[PDB]
Symmetry: C3
Subunit: 447 residues, 3 copies
């Protein structure tokens, strides 16, 4: 893992390079079945406590079954509808007549089986729980008589253990309108997930990747409820396919860059916009503005292209030349010089203004650097914490090399009188045009 | 269900009509009691494992009881205080002396009972768990001797099952400062909720509505902890009363509308503001800006007026004439032409700019539409996915009719030199006044 | 508890005073160990149901152990890395050879013990669960033979109870990448937390404070996973140290202040910015802009300085003189006069504009106050609810004294023609300078 960082003194921004990205570009759906028992209440003369315990657990089984039924009778729309059409397409096929009977026959003797549906896909189905065999074989002879037979206490415990997975799956599907993410161990055990990864149409290097990051895989997966019909509970798990592997990725960090005059009210500020994760993707750059869309593990990043923006690759030139014409680099302006700090991958940017006490300390040496007014940076080599005012941040102690790219702060190139200080989604060149417009009103009204 | 949609080419916005709204306007509180056992530790000479299991579960019962006590001794304020005064008013009455004794007497023989409190309301109380009868009858003869009696293994399992609901209710009330939402199956089982709906002072059509959408009802309900006193645990469930039923509701979708010049830096943008859910409400329009405030089920919408804004009904004319003087329609401006798409109820708005590759595909036919630069729309009829750059969205496959309302994009009516490009919460007429002000500075400085 | 409030009619803002703050300034780490059993599968000829139940629970024990191992083999970075360096420093020491053996020896006979690590700290270690003794003593004689011995049903239940805490701790550490907050009862029981508070190097008054607010303490704590190695599961709990106790704190509430002309489009608005919690802190003021960073219990506030801004104490003069030169008080401007209300600690600010029906009611008297157009305030004395349009808010019924500070609304001091209506993070003096600039263009172009 070659993680490196670059602080640009001129724009008060840093870029953390060297990350290998795995971008989600496709979906792999799989059908998960639970064999249920079509057992209407069959209540008999019962008294001894083992029978009461069985009848109680049996009512919890019926309530979970009717709840999954009212969940499929009326399914509320979810904010995930734009990401689940593939798994939903499998559920719509399962609703066809005879289709639940097909998977019901293929999984008659085995747990796993490939099934060609009436919509063509050769989908892979599994069978993680068998309640029809247990209730109809171990319980009906106990409840299908004039008076109930006495089950042994081992059966009471075994039925509470088996029925448990059904109750938790019904709880998640009910509170989330049939669509859950991340995918829990109740929907798919770690053992079942690794077996599903092994059976995926991916390279052996991708199976090793998803198997070594199962929690991230779970967080980028969906579990979709299909149907309860004819003693079968089926639901689709939608797993990520990372069509982009090992693509270069980097993270942009930005902090306010103000002037440091001694008279308050005479200072102007500037901040680069669009901080977050950038990855090379198909001749363009995929930008992820939201913080939860990229999970990081050491050297590696796992992003979902669902919540990304597609930018031309020239967007990276804002990191090397912000005044560069191939790309209109974006900034925001204000006159709000409040001190702050940003913890980067290998150090910390500190924007210190006013009377704020900014410093960087080592746990055993004490304060090793005092920041003056302006925007500065310190590496994690020898630094443990950074204090800005009354706030103390912890520096990431990850190994890597930092580079301080010295340069004049670009905020000094601007005349304060004509500066646009109210700008939000503004470009470097847009700001220069507003300055030419305020300068033309004085050029004409001097001549 | 008559769901229809209208895309306005002129403003790059769409309106999804035909939804029937159910707006929350009132609250129905109900008291939920759990009979507890005032049993101080009564530890005796115990050794056999059944006694250990009982004593362990009994300590978990005392810790849950003392935790509910420290929860009512000091109750942290919650961000829900502006929505729970009705249920809280019932809890303040329960704290009166003799009032817990009243409900304790009315529920002596039955589970449900109406109780007239010392604040007048005829409230409906229930009794979902009876631990006083079970501990004092089944457990004290086992622990109230010199040496403990041996309980059978059926009692150990039955006590872990009954004590379980207490522990989960105490967990939710403890982590949430006594106020939980949504209302879980631990606070109120699906069986108890449907019975509470049946006993509500609502029409039979509203009971069928809440009973068919119990999860949405749960998400729009509160469970408030009252008091633990004199062998009684009481808490109030605050359920929604939908005074507005079947009111017309619609959803506004907006997307950036920019000019498409070939020289970057010469383009101006405009976006309609206030996207979200609108419902007719009491001679006005209730607007819901936040995304989680309206749950949708097929044709129907369930909103809470707690987080809504009240607008004049003329706000709908921004959908028919945005240049119309009865209402100052709102826009935001910029020069940020980044491509994007919005998945609507029956199609997709696509704002394509620059070199971005925007398209709409069918699963079996491939690309069926390529968007050019500007703002456009495509219906879900025959369309499965929409790609903008490296991002792929899924189109909602819901049945309904779309209408493409052709019209000149209003961004073309604006001169770029005098356009206000930094506007956030700006009106159509506000922007026109800023244009008259920049045009007067050139009219006077030409004459 | 002396809670008081002050409404400033001139700026449409209120300040709730009298709160005693407890600001987190340090961390107290403690090591929590669980003795595990290094037991490879030792599967034997087993058939009777008690053996099946044991073997099932034993596989759930191994899966939880391997999951904690893959969690420590690859630990994903978390957004909490800037707040956990202290507890992480203890985990890095535990990874040293012989260091897990040290705590393994000190806790050989007792549950609690102070341990001097190979990094100096005298840390306090505990031992909350002993699975090595239970599996190796109660289970291996049952599974380490040619054919498995029959365990009694008491052992099956006791092992499911003991193994349970391991499975829930592994679930939380797995889904959260080894760092959880708040700290659950699974990580640390209420009994263990109070005992940890008693053993803390704090005054007796701080132990009473944290013990009376354990849920807030839990919400401001972290549980960090260390290592699984040599039959020991260790994880660090990072508890808050409140170096600031009983410091004066107050909460600023702001609401839009517009003009009330009868011709729409001629009104200008202004809103004070930086609403939230303020606390005196080390010669400065700690401001908390985010809503979840301060938990309130009656009179008291518990904040974390991690997400605060440090402001000069002159920031309070925006509450007494907003036109005052020692501090540049901040405002935002617009022309968006939409009615709204803010529920304060002791009353409600109501900003009423247009045709909106704003009122304040008592539950038994009905409407007791009708607001006219402008910004106004009403105390909670005699008031239960406040209605703005179709929205009804509940007034906090907390006891305290309100003071209505009468004054001319400052929005009336501004000429509408030259007002800057697009301002976001703007100062009072910044706005005055933009007004001098628009007035100079007319002074020179009249002369
Ligand atoms: C003003 O416009 C000219 C175009 O001739 C350009 O070269 C110059 O950079 C502009 N001024 C500023 C301050 O950007
Ligand atoms: C300028 O003001 C006049 C008022 O006489 C108005 O009719 C016109 O629409 C305004 N101009 C623009 C571009 O809105
Ligand atoms: C204009 O500038 C002068 C400085 O001489 C200042 O005193 C005055 O307050 C400014 N005007 C406004 C409206 O703030």
């Amino acid at each position: 893992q070659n993680i490196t960082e670059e602080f640009y003194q001129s724009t008060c921004s840093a870029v953390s390079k060297g990350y290998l990205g795995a971008l989600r570009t496709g979906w792999y759906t799989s059908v998960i079945t639970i064999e249920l028992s079509n057992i209407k209440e069959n209540k008999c003369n019962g008294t001894d406590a083992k029978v009461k315990l069985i009848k109680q657990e049996l009512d919890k089984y019926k309530n979970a079954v009717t709840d999954l039924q009212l969940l499929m009778q009326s399914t509320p729309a979810t904010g995930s509808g734009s990401a689940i059409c593939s798994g939903v397409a499998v559920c719509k096929v399962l609703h066809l007549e005879g289709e639940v009977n097909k998977i019901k026959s293929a999984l008659l003797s085995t747990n796993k089986a490939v099934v060609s549906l009436s919509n063509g896909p050769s989908v892979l189905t599994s069978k993680v729980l068998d309640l029809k065999n247990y209730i109809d074989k171990q319980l009906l002879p106990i409840v299908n008589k004039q008076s109930c037979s006495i089950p042994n206490i081992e059966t009471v415990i075994e039925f509470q253990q088996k029925n448990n997975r059904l109750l938790e799956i019904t709880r998640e599907f009910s509170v989330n309108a049939g669509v859950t993410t991340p995918v829990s161990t109740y929907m798919l055990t770690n053992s079942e997930l690794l077996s599903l990864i092994n059976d995926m149409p991916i390279t052996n290097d991708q199976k090793k990747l998803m198997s070594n990051n199962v929690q991230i895989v779970r967080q980028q997966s969906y579990s979709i409820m299909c149907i309860i019909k004819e003693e079968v509970l089926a639901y689709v798990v939608q797993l990520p396919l990372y069509g982009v592997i090992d693509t270069p990725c980097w993270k942009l960090h930005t902090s306010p860059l103000c002037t440091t005059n001694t008279k308050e009210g005479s200072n102007i500020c500037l901040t680069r916009t669009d901080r977050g994760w950038y990855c090379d993707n198909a001749g363009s750059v995929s930008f992820f503005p939201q913080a939860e869309t990229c999970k990081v593990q050491s050297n590696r990043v796992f992003c979902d292209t669902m919540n990304s923006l597609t930018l031309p690759s020239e967007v990276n030139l804002c990191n090397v030349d912000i005044f560069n014409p191939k790309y209109d680099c974006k900034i925001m302006t204000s006159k709000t010089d409040v001190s702050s700090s940003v913890i980067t991958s290998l150090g910390a940017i500190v924007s210190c203004y006013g009377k704020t006490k900014c410093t960087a300390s080592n746990k055993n040496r004490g304060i090793i650097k005092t920041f003056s007014n302006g925007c500065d940076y310190v590496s994690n080599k020898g630094v443990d914490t950074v204090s800005v005012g009354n706030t103390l941040y912890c520096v990431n102690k990850q190994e890597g090399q930092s580079l301080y790219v010295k340069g004049e702060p670009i905020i000094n190139f601007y005349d304060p009188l004509v500066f646009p200080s109210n700008q939000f989604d503004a470009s470097i060149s847009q700001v220069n045009e507003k300055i030419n417009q305020s300068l033309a009103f004085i050029r004409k009204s001097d001549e």
